[PDB]
């Protein structure tokens, strides 16, 4: 005789969903995404001083 | 004493007698998770 029960007073918090754009650190980035990066060889970024 | 017998044809089956209650909902009050527990026991009858 093995009885299976379930509480009605207390519920869990399984997942803690942390988004990076919720953080204060997301200033220091420029978060632009490719949906194609693995197809790319050496990409370059220019500066004129 | 006898020649022709009576033999069952249908195999028996099973009735699910008790199983673990595991649900969740993505958040609607907090109490409606409990009323979702009764939705799944009614589907087991």
The experimental method is: cryo-EM
Considering only CB atoms, A6 lies closest to which of B18, B30, B37, namely: B37
Annotated resolution, angstroms? 4.2
Q: Whose structure tokens read 């009576």?
A: B6
Rounded Cα distance between B14 and B32, Å, is 31
Contact A4, B37 (CB under 8 A): no
Helix, strand, coil % over all residues of chain A, rounded to 5: 15, 0, 85
Distance from C-alpha of B45 to C-alpha of B40, rounded to nearest angstrom: 9
For an interface test with A, the pick among B34, B35, B39, B44 (most A C-beta atoms closer than 10 Å) comes out as B34
| Rounded-to-integer distance, Cα A4 and Cα B19, Å | 7
Q: Do the chains contact at A11 and B20, CB–CB below 8 Å?
A: no
Encoded tokens for B7: 């033999």
Q: Which chain A residue has the Cα nearest residue B27?
A: A13
């Amino acid at each position: 005789d093995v009885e299976f029960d379930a509480l009605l007073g207390s519920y869990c918090n399984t997942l803690s969903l942390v988004r990076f754009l919720e953080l204060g650190l997301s200033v220091a980035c420029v978060c632009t995404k490719f949906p194609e990066l693995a197809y790319m060889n050496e990409g370059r970024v220019q500066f004129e001083v | 004493e006898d020649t022709e017998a009576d033999v069952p044809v249908t195999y028996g089956e099973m009735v699910l007698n008790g199983a673990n209650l595991v649900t969740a909902l993505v958040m609607r009050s907090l109490d409606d998770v409990g009323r979702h527990l009764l939705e799944m026991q009614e589907e087991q009858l």
